[PDB]
Structures are given as structure tokens and as C-alpha cells.
Amino acid sequence: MRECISIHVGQAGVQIGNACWELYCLEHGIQPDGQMPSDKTIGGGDDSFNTFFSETGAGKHVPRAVFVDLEPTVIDEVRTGTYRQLFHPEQLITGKEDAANNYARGHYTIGKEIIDLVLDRIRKLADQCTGLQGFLVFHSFGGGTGSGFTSLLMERLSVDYGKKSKLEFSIYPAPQVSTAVVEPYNSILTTHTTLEHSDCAFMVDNEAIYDICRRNLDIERPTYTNLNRLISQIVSSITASLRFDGALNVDLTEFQTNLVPYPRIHFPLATYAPVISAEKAYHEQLSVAEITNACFEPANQMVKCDPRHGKYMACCLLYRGDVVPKDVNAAIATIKTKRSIQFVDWCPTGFKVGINYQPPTVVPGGDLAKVQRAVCMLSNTTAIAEAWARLDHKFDLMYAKRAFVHWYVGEGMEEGEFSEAREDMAALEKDYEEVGVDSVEGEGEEEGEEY
Amino acid sequence: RLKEGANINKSLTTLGKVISALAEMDSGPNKNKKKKKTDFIPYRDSVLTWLLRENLGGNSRTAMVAALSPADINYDETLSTLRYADRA
Amino acid sequence: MREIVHIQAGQCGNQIGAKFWEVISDEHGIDPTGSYHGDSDLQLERINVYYNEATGNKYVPRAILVDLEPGTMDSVRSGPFGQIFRPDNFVFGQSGAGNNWAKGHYTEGAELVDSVLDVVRKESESCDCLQGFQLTHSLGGGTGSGMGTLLISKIREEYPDRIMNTFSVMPSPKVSDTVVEPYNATLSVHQLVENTDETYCIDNEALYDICFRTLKLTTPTYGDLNHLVSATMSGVTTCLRFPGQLNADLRKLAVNMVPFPRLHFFMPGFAPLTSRGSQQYRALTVPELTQQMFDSKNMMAACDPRHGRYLTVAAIFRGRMSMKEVDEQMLNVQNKNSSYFVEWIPNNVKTAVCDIPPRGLKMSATFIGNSTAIQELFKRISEQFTAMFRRKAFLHWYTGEGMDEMEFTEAESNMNDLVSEYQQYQDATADEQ
Ligand SMILES: CC(=O)O[C@H]1C(=O)[C@@]2(C)[C@H]([C@H](OC(=O)c3ccccc3)[C@]3(O)C[C@H](OC(=O)[C@H](O)[C@@H](NC(=O)c4ccccc4)c4ccccc4)C(C)=C1C3(C)C)[C@]1(OC(C)=O)CO[C@@H]1C[C@@H]2O
Ligand SMILES: Nc1nc2c(ncn2[C@@H]2O[C@H](COP(=O)(O)OP(=O)(O)OP(=O)(O)O)[C@@H](O)[C@H]2O)c(=O)[nH]1
Ligand SMILES: Nc1nc2c(ncn2[C@@H]2O[C@H](COP(=O)(O)OP(=O)(O)O)[C@@H](O)[C@H]2O)c(=O)[nH]1
Ligand SMILES: [Mg+2]
């Protein structure tokens, strides 16, 4: 029973969770009340997939999710929204203030005296599961809660469970635009915890998703709903390998076995190829080769970085719909002959392939067109270092004058921690510069008895 | 008994083959002083020759001593030993 | 009474096994429910090779399915021939190997191997005179490679004097679907070279080539590749089930094909193969089957025989045909292509003939080659393996499951020694000193 537990921390995490659970409820035919008329009409089936929804005796289906936040308003919206009767009434929302974009407030001062209730409910849920696979944690860098409570929760989760995988999806702050003045501080301090306790952290940038929405969907005035729907589609494509039958299934362990060369390098980029409006869905073939090629283009990346400036170390493709293996083989062979895409010499194979029969669904009121085929691309590359490097520069420009530091130390922090975190980030960058270097030389020789 | 005899005979055959190849390669270069690659010596065909790989090959010296029986009645043994002593 | 126990581990092994049981049940006229409705009386004469009898005049195959993930078992049961298998032979667990050879061999598989061995021993003890075992798996995978090698080791420990075959699907340079293919392939070959009597070399690249260029299929899928493989496996052991003018047991093939203990990797092939509409344009005769068998493009291993020498070849014909034609054709093939056959064997073509052909054909033939060119395959894997082992690309995922860096080195050294052993009988003279 391939069960997974979803954790949503912070405003961004819980809105992404809303768009998510909308998508899965649409997928499984579960009405927003939490019932499922499909089994009643047919008379029985496995459409109540155990991966996300636990089935009670009465026929209701409760999601395997925990929502956490310090601001009561964002979860008062969902406690009185359309899906109010889907979730368990226990939402674990502290009737107090918020972290206010401060790691120390969300980790030392107010991050306490709620974490026990959280861990208690994760214990209850994990007791309810059989053969639990891993955790899918949603949060956002920069924000106070999404950094502090995520750090504390991940430390505790590593201490208790340990061997269970903990995948992470996060909102890295953009290069130019930002929604707070102390984003670099929270990012540079939460990088210390995301490096150790996580197993595979996916990063997506708001500026990149804005550019994709503007270009491909022709939405000139997007909002957060579109970005959340895209992220929900990506997560659904990731998880669909263990919910529906497929020619080549890819579980959550194959993910880490194939994408993680070394323990300190688990930061792959993610892309979704067939993003297109309904009007432009016509006049195009949308075959396997087209989507495979579009996955590799720099313009379609979900993080503002150019893969051409780095090297591809690992690659994982997850196809959905009417896809046969020979098209995937042809596309991979075609890509391998392109000089613009450079692979590290120590990874001759490079590619992991997975195929699923279930095609992607369409959310009513959405923007993505109905398509027969689709693919999701997860690539571990060295270009991601650039995405970090710029932020480090900003951190320096804030830390030379010790601006906004009294706010952090007032809640129980010390100055040196900043420096420590900075040093850790520097080390990580050095690692990303050491793995991508080519091999020394042949470095070993033999003579064929020249006498 | 059959299994033990068969495995012993296979081990002896492999040992004789490796010693014969080693002796031929010893004789050849010793008079010709050439380096006809390094040949292939089937060490891995038996665990006995595999464990003794360092002692058999490379720089080394080896010597097999074979016992006989003077009784007429045991002719089939003595001649058989000769056919193994002639090897290499 | 010669009787064969079939084992199938992993996704690839289970799929090929399902297609194989479909083919065999069609050949022996077995209904999906397990009853018999055939016509010829010779189908029940040797049905006990693969099937046990059941009280309602039913027949149940000796298949033993193994997998560390239950999805493939659910797929197999929910299929055309799912009901035929015994429910107790579905041995499986949860939390699959995840493409990790260490998990398949040491951590996870070590706990399920006891149950699998219990089922295998139960099937073995009910066999009147067991001949050997069969295994279907993929070297480049997770559960399949590790558990297959572990089961082979255990069985050879328990049954030393029985034949052990292996229809293993090895990775390819171009068509690669997993990023840790070289480690799994190396560590699997390190065990197969020791604990197997016969191994058949299969890869998806050659089967795709056959589908594209011979059958002219526009959109082939895994079903067709499994179909070709299953045709080969049914062809190999035909002489155990039907009468013949010149029989050929599995042990006869092993004796004639294997000159030395470590050279037991074979290149399979099947004839005839035609693309539907072309069927009327070409006659079926023994010369045509011989021409197609020895064609370079018909091999299912992606190793060109022209880059080496055939140590041995075996041909198993099925159908009513004249022995003079077979002998003359094999002698002609030996004489004309004199440079592609090893010089120090006077005659290295085994021939066998069986009267009964397949259902919808008049004649057919299976080809099993043993040539030096197979070393190329191993070399390619080595050419990748070191390129990942020098920098320790994904090594920690293995060392966290109990393994060690020395074991990789032993596997590499063993494969290199095998490659050298094949390479020695590959140049077309040895005169200069
Ligand atoms: C009726 C007739 O004359 O037509 C042939 C036919 O057209 C051809 C093309 C058949 C046909 O095969 C294919 O199209 C095919 C496609 C993908 C992979 C493999 C085969 C045939 O389908 C296959 C089928 O073969 C059999 O029935 C054999 O007994 C075969 N068994 C099965 O294919 C089988 C299929 C489903 C379920 C159970 C068994 C077999 C082969 C070896 C050993 C035992 C059995 C035959 C005679 C034909 C058709 C029907 C068109 C061929 O079949 C084989 C492998 O013998 C492909 O090339 C040969 C030569 C034939 O001329
Ligand atoms: N992609 C995406 N990002 C969001 C969304 N909502 C908020 N964010 C990001 O979150 C950042 C703001 O910090 P939050 O994550 O909201 O912090 P918080 O959850 O409110 O916790 P506090 O700081 O204590 O209030 C912004 O910079 C956004 O980039 C969303 O709906 N989609
Ligand atoms: N012929 C064939 N090969 C397959 C099939 N499925 C997977 N493979 C091959 O097996 C490899 C994957 O190994 P896998 O079956 O997942 O190993 P497992 O996880 O232990 O079962 C791939 O490289 C494929 O080439 C199939 O249905 N048919
Ligand atoms: Mg907040």
C-alpha cells in the first residue's frame, strides 16, 4: 500500500495544498464533500486509492494531509470554503501571532508549543499507514513560518522516523522581484537544514513560472492560482507512478537511487513540457519527441538559470498517456547527439525512463489544455549553483552593515549562526564546482611488452 | 563417492592444464627471450588453482613428486600415475 | 521423465514468463481455465514436462513468480492467463529493491529467499526425475538481477548435478532506461559466470532491430519482444516434449556447446520471420531457414558474429524435412564461411530435428550460437562501469546496504578475465613467436 503523507507549512504551502487536493479529488472522482459516487454506481473498485485518501467505514474519504500555519486567517478560508467537509477538523493552527518573516521567531520563540501537536498527529497518521513510503513537505523559503517551522519539523522528523524519504518542494526567492526585505536571511539560514535532513529538494521560482504562463498560455495577468496549479500538476506527475498501472513504474526509491550521485547534491530542477493554451493546443502534433525536446529548452525551466552554463549530471523522465517505449528511445538518442546539452563524463548512461498509462486530467476553470501525452522532466545539473550565488551576494550586502539583525537576535539568536550558515552555503557551492569538473586524465597506463 | 571422485578428477585435470601451460610459457621465453603477450592461464577454472595463483605463476619455482607402487597387482595405479607424472 | 521447474523474477521476467506460458498453453492446447481441448493425441504424451495434474483433469504450470513489489503480480493475475497459476506460487513482499542491487541481494531479498526456496523445494520434491531449472530476469534492473543471482546460488548449493539455464536480458548502449545499469550488470555477471550452466544473451536493441527491419512493425511494444523471446525458449526444449528423428536434450546442448566451463554465454535466434504481406513471396525450405538463421541481423544479442569466430553453434529444426538437406546445408555453411569458425574444432555445428512444427507453420528452426564476439558486450559494460567507479558516482547507495568497495573490484576483475578468455580464441592464427 504505497502511502504518502503530505505536509503543508506556511501560506504558500497551504495554497499549493489547496490547488493540489483539488487536482487529486478531481482525479479520483471524490466529490468535494469527501464521498465518491463512482463505487456506488459501479458497485466496488480500487478508485479509493490508498496513496492519499484513507477510507472510513461509512464510505467517506479523508485526505492524508496535515495543514500547519501560525496565521489563523489563511486556514479560516479553507475551514469555511468548498472543501470544508473534506478535511479532518483538526488543523493545528496556533491562535497567536506569526513569525513575521523572522527565522528566530518561527524556530525558537513561537515555533515551540505547537510542534508537539503536529508531531502527535503525524504519529497518528503514520500509525494509520501500512508500508509508508515518504513525506512530501510544501513550504517557501524567505518566509518566516515556512523557514522556521519547516526547519524544526524536519529536524524532529529526521530524529524520529529517520529512514523514511522526505521529499521537499519549496519556493526559492526570485533573482529580481521579491515580496519582503529579509528574504535572503531566511533562505541563507534555512539552507543549513535543507541540506542535511532532506533527501531530495525541488526548487521552483515565481519569475520563471510567470514567464511560462505569459509565453505559452498567453495569460498576461496571472495570479498565484496558476502557479499553484502548475506545481500541483508537477507533483501529480511525480506521484502518479504508484497510483496507476504503467509499462515502466518508477517508485520513490528509484527517484533517489537514480538522481542523487552524492548525499550533498540532491537539488534537481523540474520542468513540465506540454504547457499550452486551448487555442494553441491545435496546430501542433504534441508527439513524444516534441515534448521531450521542449523539456530541455532553457526557456521552459521553472527556475531562473541557464542549463547551458552547467552540465547535466542526472536525468529522469516521467511520461503520462499514450506513450510507447520506442518513441522515448528515439527522443533520448536524438538528445544525446546534441552538442548544446553536455553530460558529465562520469555518467555514460544519464537517463531514467518511466511510463504511465493514466493521462493528465483537466481542472474545471483551469488554463491547461486537454492533451493525450505528457512528460515531466527532473534533471540534476550544476547550473543550480548560479541560482544560489546571486542570493549569497545579497546576503553579503545585508550582513556587512548588520542591518535587520537586532530583530533576529532579540528572539534568541546569536550573530555567529549567520556566519556558520554562510560558511555552509559556501562549502555547498564548492561541492557543486568540484563534482562537475571533468576527470583528470586517463590516469593509468599499461605497456604491451615493448621488448 | 562418485561426486568426490568426479570433483577430484576435474581439479586434477585443471591443475595439470595450468601447470602444462605455465611450463610451456617458461620454456619458450627462456630460450627465445620474447614476450608473446602474457598468454592466458586458466586459473579461475578451479578453486585449487585459484588459491595457489601466486605460487604457481609469476616468478616462482615448482616441483611435483609422484609415488609409485612396486606390486604387480596394482599395475593400473602405477601406469595411471605415470600418465599424470608425464604431464607438464 | 524429464521435468523443468520455471522461475521468473522481476518485472521483465514476469512479463516474459506470462507470454511464455501463453505460447506453451497454445502449443499444448490448454484452456485459460486449465482444461484441455486440443486435437492431436501427442500433446498429452509429454505434458508433464511443464504441468502438474489436478483433480478435475486440470493442468497447472510449475511457474514460480517472485517480485519485491506486488504491482506486477496484480498485473499478471488480472490477465488472460492469470487463473492458470497456483495461488501459492505468488511469493512477494513490499518496498521493492528500487534499482539497488544491494537491496535485492543482501537486505530485502535475503528475507524472501527462504520462502521462495521453500516453494521451489516443494515443487522439486514432487518431480519424478528433475532435469533442470529455468530463470527469466533482467541484469540491468533491481529485484530481478539480485534475487535471480541469489536464488541461482542457493539452488546450485542444493542441487549441484541439475542443469541451470538463464534467459537474461542484458543492457544496451543506446537503449538504456536506468542510470545504474553498469553496476547491476557487472555484479550480476560476476555471479552468472560461476553458478550457471547456460546463459542466453538477450537485449532490447536487437529485438527492436528485428521488429523494425524484419517484421516491419510500425509501433512495436514489449509484447512483441516477449513474443520473440518466448518463441526462442519454446524452441530450445522442443525435443523433450515431442518425438524426433534425432533428439537433442538440454544436456546434449550443454555438452556440445560448452568447450570450457566459463564459456557458456549464447546468442539465440529464430526462423522464419516475415512481415505479413511478404509471406506469399518467399518459399519455406531448409536452405531458407539456414540462410535466415546465420544472417547477422537475426541475432537477438546486438553482437555482430563477423567480428569474431563461432566456437560452437547448435540448430534445432522443427518439421518434417530431409536429413540430407540439413547436413548438406550445415556443411556448406561451415565450408563457405571458413574464416568465421574456429580452426581447432573439426565440426562445430550440432543439429537436431523434431517432427512436430509449430501450430500455424510447416517448418521452423531455433539457433544457439557461441562465438567470441559476445566479449564486445561485456567490454562495453566495463567501458561504462569504470567510468562510474573511478569517481564513485552512485556508490554510497550500495555501501549503505552492507556492501564493500572490494566486491566491485572482484566483479570487474572477473568480467575482465572472462573477456580475455573469450578473446584468446579470436585471432585467426597463432604462428609467430
Ligand atoms: C497463420 C500464418 O501462416 O501466419 C503466420 C505469420 O504470418 C508469420 C508472419 C508469424 C506471425 O507472427 C507475428 O506476427 C509476430 C509478431 C511479433 C512477434 C512475433 C511474431 C503470427 O502472428 C504468428 C503465428 O505463429 C504461431 O501460431 C506459432 O505457433 C507461434 N505461436 C504464436 O505466435 C502464438 C501467438 C499467440 C498465442 C499463442 C501463440 C509459435 C512460434 C514458436 C514456437 C511456438 C509457437 C503464425 C503461424 C502466423 C501469424 C498468426 C500471423 C511469425 O510468427 C512466428 C514468430 O512464428 C512472425 O514471423 C513468423 C512467420 C509467419 O509467416
Ligand atoms: N508560488 C507561490 N508562492 C507563494 C504563494 N504564496 C506566497 N508565496 C511566496 O511566499 C513568500 C511570502 O512568505 P510566506 O511563505 O507567505 O510566509 P508565511 O507562510 O506567510 O509565514 P510568515 O512569514 O510567518 O507570515 C512570497 O515571497 C511568495 O513568493 C503562492 O500562492 N504561490
Ligand atoms: N523485454 C522486456 N524488457 C523489459 C520489460 N520491462 C522492463 N524491461 C527491461 O528491464 C530493465 C528494467 O529492469 P526491471 O524489469 O525494472 O527490473 P526489476 O525492477 O527488478 O523488475 C529495462 O532496462 C528494460 O530494458 C518488458 O516488459 N519486456
Ligand atoms: Mg505567514
Side-chain angles (χ1 to χ4, degrees):
Chain A
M1 301 320 104
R2 293 88 59 189
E3 291 166 295
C4 309
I5 297 159
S6 303
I7 301 283
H8 306 280
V9 170
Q11 178 153 21
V14 299
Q15 312 215 31
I16 290 170
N18 282 346
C20 269
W21 286 116
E22 173 162 298
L23 167 39
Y24 314 75
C25 281
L26 260 290
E27 263 218 34
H28 288 19
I30 313 197
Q31 294 190 194
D33 64 345
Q35 297 272 350
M36 188 184 105
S38 289
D39 267 340
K40 292 183 179 182
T41 302
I42 291 154
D46 210 284
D47 284 346
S48 66
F49 291 124
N50 310 311
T51 298
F52 284 122
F53 294 93
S54 171
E55 157 282 336
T56 87
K60 194 182 173 192
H61 300 94
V62 192
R64 285 194 180 81
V66 178
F67 278 44
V68 169
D69 192 81
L70 310 178
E71 300 174 277
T73 184
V74 65
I75 314 298
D76 277 352
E77 301 305 19
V78 79
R79 264 200 271 246
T80 326
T82 303
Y83 301 103
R84 94 182 81 90
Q85 298 177 9
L86 185 62
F87 294 115
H88 196 267
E90 221 178 43
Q91 292 286 298
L92 301 82
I93 309 307
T94 318
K96 292 187 183 175
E97 311 76 340
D98 41 307
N101 312 8
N102 164 331
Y103 184 13
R105 200 162 164 84
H107 200 85
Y108 294 146
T109 312
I110 293 164
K112 318 286 258 184
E113 65 223 9
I114 172 58
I115 190 67
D116 224 295
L117 192 69
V118 184
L119 292 169
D120 198 21
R121 212 185 151 196
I122 328 183
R123 145 168 33 251
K124 277 201 163 84
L125 290 153
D127 279 14
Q128 211 170 99
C129 329
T130 303
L132 173 61
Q133 297 278 35
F135 291 77
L136 312 179
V137 180
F138 295 81
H139 71 116
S140 55
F141 283 25
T145 325
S147 88
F149 210 79
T150 316
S151 51
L152 181 43
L153 191 82
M154 281 295 268
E155 186 185 21
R156 297 295 205 79
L157 289 156
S158 35
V159 167
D160 308 36
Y161 291 102
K163 294 322 281 183
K164 295 298 185 331
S165 307
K166 297 176 276 290
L167 286 44
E168 191 181 282
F169 302 86
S170 70
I171 288 304
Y172 198 69
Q176 292 268 14
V177 310
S178 150
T179 80
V181 316
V182 297
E183 269 189 338
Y185 284 150
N186 300 276
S187 162
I188 290 295
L189 301 187
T190 190
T191 189
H192 163 286
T193 177
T194 205
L195 179 128
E196 308 181 73
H197 300 299
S198 282
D199 267 44
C200 182
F202 304 95
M203 291 215 168
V204 301
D205 208 333
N206 280 342
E207 276 190 32
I209 305 160
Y210 287 157
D211 280 358
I212 318 151
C213 279
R214 193 200 41 61
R215 164 171 320 300
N216 288 322
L217 301 203
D218 273 9
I219 307 329
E220 185 54 285
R221 321 210 83 79
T223 88
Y224 288 171
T225 306
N226 311 340
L227 323 184
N228 297 27
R229 276 167 183 168
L230 261 77
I231 292 156
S232 158
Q233 285 287 342
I234 287 146
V235 177
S236 183
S237 198
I238 283 156
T239 308
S241 282
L242 53 87
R243 287 187 299 164
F244 310 97
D245 212 338
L248 276 156
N249 276 309
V250 187
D251 213 332
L252 288 176
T253 303
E254 305 193 11
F255 251 75
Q256 299 157 248
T257 296
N258 291 256
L259 266 178
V260 173
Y262 308 98
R264 301 167 57 80
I265 277 174
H266 57 277
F267 291 85
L269 293 163
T271 82
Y272 198 71
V275 71
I276 195 60
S277 64
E279 294 89 314
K280 294 161 67 141
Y282 313 126
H283 320 293
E284 293 212 320
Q285 319 195 43
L286 276 37
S287 66
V288 189
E290 194 301 350
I291 60 180
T292 305
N293 289 339
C295 261
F296 275 101
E297 302 286 6
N300 296 327
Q301 303 300 309
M302 311 265 297
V303 195
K304 210 70 153 188
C305 43
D306 207 311
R308 294 173 292 182
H309 296 171
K311 292 190 172 184
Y312 283 89
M313 292 160 31
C315 211
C316 168
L317 299 151
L318 308 169
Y319 292 89
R320 305 182 71 169
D322 178 15
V323 172
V324 291
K326 71 112 203 169
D327 290 84
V328 177
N329 297 323
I332 287 155
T334 278
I335 291 286
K336 275 187 180 170
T337 61
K338 265 183 195 331
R339 293 179 64 269
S340 147
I341 291 152
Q342 292 200 64
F343 270 78
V344 305
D345 56 64
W346 54 267
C347 190
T349 53
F351 288 93
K352 179 70 170 99
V353 172
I355 291 154
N356 199 278
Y357 292 135
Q358 183 61 47
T361 72
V362 176
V363 202
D367 321 66
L368 285 148
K370 181 173 155 300
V371 198
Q372 292 160 62
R373 286 163 278 275
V375 63
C376 182
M377 147 72 83
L378 305 189
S379 34
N380 198 341
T381 82
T382 56
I384 195 58
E386 302 315 344
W388 288 318
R390 284 201 281 300
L391 194 42
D392 263 8
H393 178 75
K394 290 187 190 172
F395 183 81
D396 310 352
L397 265 189
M398 218 76 72
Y399 197 63
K401 320 186 277 177
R402 301 293 198 281
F404 305 93
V405 172
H406 58 303
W407 286 109
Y408 286 68
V409 310
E411 295 292 329
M413 271 205 88
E414 51 275 60
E415 273 194 58
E417 200 89 353
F418 284 96
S419 296
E420 202 275 296
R422 184 64 169 72
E423 272 140 46
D424 223 326
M425 201 85 208
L428 178 55
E429 269 145 286
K430 205 182 91 66
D431 281 285
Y432 259 93
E433 201 56 0
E434 201 195 50
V435 67
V437 76
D438 302 306
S439 167
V440 170
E441 211 70 0
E443 64 185 292
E445 55 278 325
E446 183 266 6
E447 54 148 30
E449 270 147 321
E450 294 177 350
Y451 33 91
Chain B
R1 184 71 41 100
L2 179 59
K3 197 162 77 207
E4 289 168 346
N7 261 48
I8 290 162
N9 287 345
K10 279 172 71 171
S11 172
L12 292 194
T13 290
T14 305
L15 179 57
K17 202 193 301 194
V18 58
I19 299 159
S20 175
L22 253 170
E24 192 269 3
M25 180 209 161
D26 158 74
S27 314
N30 273 13
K31 313 188 279 269
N32 311 149
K33 298 85 163 190
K34 288 314 295 149
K35 308 304 289 142
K36 168 198 254 272
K37 54 174 308 303
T38 52
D39 273 18
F40 177 73
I41 298 285
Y43 288 118
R44 285 177 179 277
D45 282 0
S46 157
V47 74
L48 176 58
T49 58
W50 184 229
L51 291 166
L52 309 168
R53 171 164 167 279
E54 281 315 336
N55 313 137
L56 258 297
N59 72 96
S60 51
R61 208 78 66 176
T62 184
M64 180 173 278
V65 307
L68 304 212
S69 170
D72 56 353
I73 54 165
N74 309 326
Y75 164 83
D76 300 338
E77 301 86 310
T78 72
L79 165 53
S80 181
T81 291
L82 307 211
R83 294 222 171 61
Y84 192 74
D86 183 23
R87 289 307 322 278
Chain C
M1 327 327 150
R2 286 72 51 81
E3 313 174 341
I4 291 159
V5 173
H6 185 86
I7 301 160
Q8 47 194 72
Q11 178 169 297
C12 170
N14 279 319
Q15 306 247 291
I16 290 162
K19 183 61 65 172
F20 168 64
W21 287 116
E22 209 174 286
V23 169
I24 294 292
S25 299
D26 196 336
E27 197 168 18
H28 285 276
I30 286 286
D31 195 276
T33 193
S35 308
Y36 169 79
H37 72 57
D39 43 2
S40 173
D41 197 11
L42 299 167
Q43 307 196 350
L44 266 85
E45 191 145 71
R46 303 279 152 207
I47 195 165
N48 58 49
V49 175
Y50 279 115
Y51 294 90
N52 291 313
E53 270 196 359
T55 185
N57 212 257
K58 270 178 69 156
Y59 299 89
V60 177
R62 298 177 199 282
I64 296 162
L65 299 90
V66 187
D67 198 342
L68 308 178
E69 195 72 47
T72 278
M73 311 295 218
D74 281 20
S75 200
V76 167
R77 272 201 297 279
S78 300
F81 278 74
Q83 263 68 32
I84 203 182
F85 301 114
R86 193 175 285 162
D88 324 313
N89 294 336
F90 285 78
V91 184
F92 60 93
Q94 279 88 346
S95 71
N99 283 29
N100 212 353
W101 190 91
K103 281 191 192 289
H105 200 80
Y106 285 112
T107 292
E108 302 294 341
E111 294 177 353
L112 201 71
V113 72
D114 287 72
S115 297
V116 174
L117 258 290
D118 263 4
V119 174
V120 169
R121 196 183 299 96
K122 176 174 295 317
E123 291 289 355
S124 210
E125 286 173 357
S126 292
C127 261
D128 201 80
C129 160
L130 209 170
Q131 178 145 67
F133 301 82
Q134 291 182 341
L135 189 72
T136 322
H137 61 113
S138 67
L139 310 193
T143 88
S145 170
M147 283 268 276
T149 54
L150 188 69
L151 289 166
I152 290 158
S153 173
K154 297 277 189 176
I155 291 156
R156 294 285 291 187
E157 225 192 68
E158 264 196 49
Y159 298 97
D161 86 85
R162 307 299 186 200
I163 289 293
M164 171 85 68
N165 299 68
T166 296
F167 296 89
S168 53
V169 174
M170 321 205 198
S172 307
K174 296 185 178 179
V175 177
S176 45
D177 303 329
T178 67
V179 81
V180 292
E181 274 186 0
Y183 293 158
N184 300 348
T186 303
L187 275 84
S188 201
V189 168
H190 166 66
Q191 303 281 319
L192 286 173
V193 61
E194 276 129 33
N195 298 324
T196 278
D197 282 58
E198 297 180 347
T199 305
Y200 295 92
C201 309
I202 292 155
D203 43 358
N204 307 141
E205 181 206 340
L207 298 165
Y208 276 124
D209 195 310
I210 288 158
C211 281
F212 283 8
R213 264 151 69 181
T214 304
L215 304 176
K216 300 273 166 61
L217 299 171
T218 51
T219 89
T221 179
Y222 285 116
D224 309 41
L225 317 174
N226 296 358
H227 200 162
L228 291 167
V229 169
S230 324
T232 281
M233 321 176 19
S234 179
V236 162
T237 181
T238 182
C239 292
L240 294 194
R241 288 134 60 201
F242 299 118
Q245 292 165 80
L246 177 59
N247 304 118
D249 201 322
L250 281 170
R251 205 177 286 282
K252 279 179 70 170
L253 296 171
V255 165
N256 282 268
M257 292 291 296
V258 181
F260 301 109
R262 292 171 67 74
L263 310 165
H264 55 252
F265 291 83
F266 302 126
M267 269 169 9
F270 178 77
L273 296 172
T274 318
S275 62
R276 284 261 161 71
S278 172
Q279 191 27 76
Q280 58 259 31
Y281 287 100
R282 296 285 177 272
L284 274 97
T285 68
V286 166
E288 281 295 30
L289 289 176
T290 303
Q291 196 84 23
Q292 177 146 26
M293 278 160 41
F294 286 88
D295 201 314
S296 69
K297 74 173 151 153
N298 197 7
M299 310 294 81
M300 316 208 297
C303 314
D304 204 316
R306 295 172 305 227
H307 299 165
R309 295 168 104 69
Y310 280 107
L311 288 175
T312 47
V313 317
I316 316 193
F317 296 88
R318 294 151 51 91
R320 294 190 140 263
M321 61 195 80
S322 80
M323 292 296 319
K324 196 200 130 66
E325 270 201 328
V326 183
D327 284 11
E328 161 195 310
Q329 287 289 309
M330 298 324 217
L331 178 58
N332 253 37
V333 166
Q334 280 197 139
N335 286 337
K336 279 180 164 355
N337 291 325
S338 68
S339 63
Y340 297 121
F341 288 94
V342 74
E343 202 96 52
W344 51 266
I345 296 167
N347 159 273
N348 46 344
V349 178
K350 180 71 181 76
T351 59
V353 182
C354 174
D355 300 26
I356 301 205
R359 287 268 271 189
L361 299 166
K362 289 212 156 276
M363 318 204 306
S364 56
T366 279
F367 170 81
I368 307 165
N370 187 346
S371 71
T372 60
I374 185 62
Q375 56 105 20
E376 205 76 13
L377 201 43
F378 298 125
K379 198 182 263 171
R380 213 153 47 212
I381 291 157
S382 187
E383 242 178 67
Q384 291 176 334
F385 173 87
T386 185
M388 292 174 73
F389 185 74
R390 159 158 57 199
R391 301 288 296 281
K392 298 150 154 38
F394 303 86
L395 192 62
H396 80 272
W397 286 111
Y398 293 83
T399 63
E401 296 295 334
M403 268 199 333
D404 273 59
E405 296 89 346
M406 200 196 35
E407 196 168 47
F408 283 73
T409 50
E410 333 178 350
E412 166 164 320
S413 289
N414 199 352
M415 227 201 322
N416 286 12
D417 284 3
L418 171 53
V419 166
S420 180
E421 189 170 3
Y422 263 120
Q423 199 176 259
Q424 92 181 302
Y425 319 100
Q426 193 254 310
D427 268 336
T429 173
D431 293 347
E432 218 114 52
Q433 162 265 98

